Amino acid sequence: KRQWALEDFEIGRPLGKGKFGNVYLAREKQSKFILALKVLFKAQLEKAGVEHQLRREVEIQSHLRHPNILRLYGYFHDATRVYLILEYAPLGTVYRELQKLSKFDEQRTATYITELANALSYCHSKRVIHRDIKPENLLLGSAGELKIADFGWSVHAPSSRRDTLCGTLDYLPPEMIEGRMHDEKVDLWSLGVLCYEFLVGKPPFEANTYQETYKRISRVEFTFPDFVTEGARDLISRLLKHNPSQRPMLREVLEHPWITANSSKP
Amino acid sequence: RQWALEDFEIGRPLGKGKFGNVYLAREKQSKFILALKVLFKAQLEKAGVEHQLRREVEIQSHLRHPNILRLYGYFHDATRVYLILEYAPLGTVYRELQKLSKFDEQRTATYITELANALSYCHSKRVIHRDIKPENLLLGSAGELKIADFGWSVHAPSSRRDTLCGTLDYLPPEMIEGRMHDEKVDLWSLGVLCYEFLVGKPPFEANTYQETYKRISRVEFTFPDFVTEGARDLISRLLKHNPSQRPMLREVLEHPWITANSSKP
Amino acid sequence: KRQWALEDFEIGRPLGKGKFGNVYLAREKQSKFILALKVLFKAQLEKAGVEHQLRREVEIQSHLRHPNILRLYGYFHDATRVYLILEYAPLGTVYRELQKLSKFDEQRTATYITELANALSYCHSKRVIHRDIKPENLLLGSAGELKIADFGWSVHAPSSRRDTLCGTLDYLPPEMIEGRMHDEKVDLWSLGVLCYEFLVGKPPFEANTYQETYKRISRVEFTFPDFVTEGARDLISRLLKHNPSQRPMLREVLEHPWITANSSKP
Amino acid sequence: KRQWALEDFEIGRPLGKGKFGNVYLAREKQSKFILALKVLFKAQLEKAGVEHQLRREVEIQSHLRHPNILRLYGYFHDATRVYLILEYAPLGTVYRELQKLSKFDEQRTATYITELANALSYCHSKRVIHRDIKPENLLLGSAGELKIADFGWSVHAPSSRRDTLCGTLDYLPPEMIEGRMHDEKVDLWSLGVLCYEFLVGKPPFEANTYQETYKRISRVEFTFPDFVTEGARDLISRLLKHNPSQRPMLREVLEHPWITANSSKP
């Protein structure tokens, strides 16, 4: 419950250069507190009409508190730009980490799904569906812990909104790409897509064209490489079911044999 | 008594605090020289310190001690509030430290003495300052120390997590860990202060809030070679993680180094 | 492989005040490296004739490298004192933490015995027996990890040295107090005593007199409070066997059901 | 290609006192040539080792010719001590001048980085990496020109040597402190750290402890004061990248907009 401005901050090196605007390392001058400064040029926001989406991000991501959900501290607008004041994630994104390791072992994967399942559970309990779970949106804290960020696309559940689908639809479920009514079960589908990608290096329905990925997700056409263990095959196949009602609850996922067998964090 | 702004002739800016600035002022009918702390209601209400300010006025106006900066009264304009404070002719101990870099053992010893007296009086009427730093220590006409800014002071013991907005260089472990704290907070601060006076910087200074949090938590501090053994003793006594193992203000006042170097009993 | 002196260091607050001399926080001036400075007054060392065991500590503790064994960096002697340059353990001793929590849960205990068993295994493989395993000699690293220190009483195994037994013989095994020949199995007895104390708050043979503790250790007379679980009772009873040859190996301890069931670190 | 001895020189005032031994002003008796005499006591060299590094300094620094690289003329060993016969730098070190001015303007900085980038470019072309670029090792010639000295830590690139890391990791890059394989890109990182320090008065990762500075360099955590211009922020941020492959080449540095805009020497 405070008021900020740019002269309150000392800005450091670029952290990552998202679409909309870039992210910098920053320090609150009076407390020397290290955080990150997400800078968005008003022009590319208003012209692309995400001016409702940004406000949804700030509202939701600032009223949530969980160790596995990246904190948003406050916001402030310049004459030309907007500034989101975010928690700083020392170890960057899970996406870059996967670029570095190619694929994850069952223990890193298991733990990432566990931490991510906890953040999602807390999210659903306050009735929030993220809808945009992808490794570009998973940051890592100081101890290498997972932290969900970018709640721009999250809404209150259930929902029936066909938002202008601008991203690769790799992590979107059938119900969402078919513009239908979806609930919190979206994030379970995403969680499955994500477990598979962590273990294999690519998402299960990856393709060379939007339309073909649409066909693959629609018909749920995915195959495991030989090296995916039977336990991982179980959890993933459970999570990737066409009907949302046949997908497990986050508690069944947290209690799945494979998960507890390989996860280091309970 | 009741005051208003037309009762004063306002002079030069003395120091420009964050909420509002401080001016030199003169009560027109008596020609009495004091200071006028002007606070814009806007930056106060929106930052929600409207309880803290009232705490400052209550406490600092019912206290009397030569080493505690007097508050005379207050009055509110349609815009802003005005605190009528005692004038401190030699400015802050903070600017004095900026000018001299570091203090000698005699200036330090004496500042800790005067400050220990003000704190002792404060505890006896059950008051904990919690925000002891050199920006809040002013100097009287004879160079005497004068504690000011009781905004963050409360009655002891307490268990309030106040929105920690400032650098936590002078805060003790119990306070940064949002735990229950009593009057021993000011002893920790007093140690941090003795060190800074002698060295030029506080013992847990750092480049980030989180790192200073780590250093205060684990009490990680080291003396330069020039800090004498006596100062090392008093400071190490004062900087103990457990509040119950910190001395009382009387042990501090009676410490060997203190009496050996302090000019004011 | 370097030469040190006191003027190389900026000395900080007292960390703990041992009997021979005290321990201070210190910083290597040129590199700003944080460590600890153990200061021993030559007088109390020569007159108590521990001038061989000190040299044994420096030799052994400086040629050992293990994450769970506190590093000794070097040493240097003043005209009046000696200075051991040690690794700094941010979270103090396991002894003070036991004072703070009264007793440990099965998970903290299990993990402490695990880390401690790893350090001991490494120690035995280079044929080193500590002989003085007690919570006052277990320090905690930055992440809360256990770190064995104080190798003064450690010798090469096997051994048949009586040594002027000071201390208090709570953690000593029957063979050592009976001045007999002991091997590496001493540290297994100690490990058992330590597991019990972690779980209960006191060592199993604690008493009001040296002679009475001698009788209790000799006859292995110890009883569990009701709250000690069956699994812990098993591991402890195995470790506390009069004949060294009937005590498990560090691998059987590391693989014990209770241990893996409750330990967080493999 | 000549033989020297101490009786060949008239020795003058102490110039600076650099740990291994001090530096004096000297004059070659027959030619009256003014130079400097670095005197090193064999004792503090052999016992600390570095008897390989010193020979590395003499080899490399004596076979290099560049206006911005401090010449080494020859060497000779006394029964006690060794004597390096070096070029004399009339205006002392960049380190003492930084102490005197607190911080540098964009013109002094730009030019120092230019001269330094030229010396480094020449160094890489004969495949030499300095690895120890710091203001204490930059001397100033008669006309205020920058002159790199102290090539003891310089090796041929690439390398994979964990040298006993002393001094201070203020100018070392992540790859070097993590004991990994490093190439010529070490000196680009150093160059960035150096530009920042010239402009700000302190290095970007300065800290109160070795371990904390290690964390900051590792995660590349640095912030600009308000007064650092956008151009300087660009060049510094380019130079301070965790991955060596993403750092510019010395030609991109020499051709950077900020540099040419403010550098007086082409």
Swiss-Prot record, chain B:
Let me know which tissues express this protein, per UniProt: Highly expressed in testis and weakly in skeletal muscle, thymus and spleen. Also highly expressed in colon, ovarian, prostate, neuroblastoma, breast and cervical cancer cell lines.
Record-level GO BP terms: anterior/posterior axis specification; apoptotic process; cell division; centrosome localization; cilium disassembly; G2/M transition of mitotic cell cycle; liver regeneration; mitotic cell cycle
- What does the entry report regarding how activity is regulated? Activation of CDK1, appears to be an upstream event of AURKA activation. Phosphatase inhibitor-2 (PPP1R2) and TPX2 act also as activators. Inactivated by the G2 checkpoint. Inhibited by GADD45A and p53/TP53, and through dephosphorylation by protein phosphatase type 1 (PP1). MLN8054 is also a potent and selective inhibitor. Activated during the early phase of cilia disassembly in the presence of CIMAP3. Inhibited by the small molecule inhibitor VX-680.
Q: Which UniProt keywords apply?
A: ATP-binding, Cell cycle, Cell division, Cell membrane, Cell projection, Cilium, Cilium biogenesis/degradation, Cytoplasm, Cytoskeleton, Isopeptide bond, Kinase, Membrane, Microtubule, Mitosis, Nucleotide-binding, Phosphoprotein, Proto-oncogene, Serine/threonine-protein kinase, Transferase, Ubl conjugation
Q: Where is this region: Activation segment?
A: 155-168
Q: Which domain of life is it from?
A: Eukaryota
Report the locations given in the UniProt record: Cytoplasm, Cytoskeleton, Microtubule organizing center, Centrosome; Cytoplasm, Cytoskeleton, Spindle pole; Cytoplasm, Cytoskeleton, Microtubule organizing center, Centrosome, Centriole; Cell projection, Neuron projection
Q: What is its EC number?
A: 2.7.11.1
According to the UniProt entry, the cross-link of type Glycyl lysine isopeptide (Lys-Gly) (interchain with G-Cter in SUMO2) is at 133
How changing residue 149 to N affects the protein?
Abolishes cilia disassembly and kinase activity
Family assignment? Belongs to the protein kinase superfamily. Ser/Thr protein kinase family. Aurora subfamily.
Briefly state the protein's biological role: Mitotic serine/threonine kinase that contributes to the regulation of cell cycle progression. Associates with the centrosome and the spindle microtubules during mitosis and plays a critical role in various mitotic events including the establishment of mitotic spindle, centrosome duplication, centrosome separation as well as maturation, chromosomal alignment, spindle assembly checkpoint, and cytokinesis. Required for normal spindle positioning during mitosis and for the localization of NUMA1 and DCTN1 to the cell cortex during metaphase. Required for initial activation of CDK1 at centrosomes.
Q: How does it assemble?
A: Part of a complex composed of NEDD9, AURKA and CTTN; within the complex NEDD9 acts as a scaffold protein and is required for complex formation. Identified in a complex with AUNIP and NIN. Interacts with FBXL7. Interacts with CPEB1, JTB, TACC1, TPX2, PPP2CA, as well as with the protein phosphatase type 1 (PP1) isoforms PPP1CA, PPP1CB and PPP1CC. Also interacts with its substrates ARHGEF2, BORA, KIF2A, PARD3, and p53/TP53. Interaction with BORA promotes phosphorylation of PLK1. Interacts with CIMAP3. Interacts with GADD45A, competing with its oligomerization.
User: What is the protein's given name?
Assistant: Aurora kinase A
- Supply the gene name: AURKA
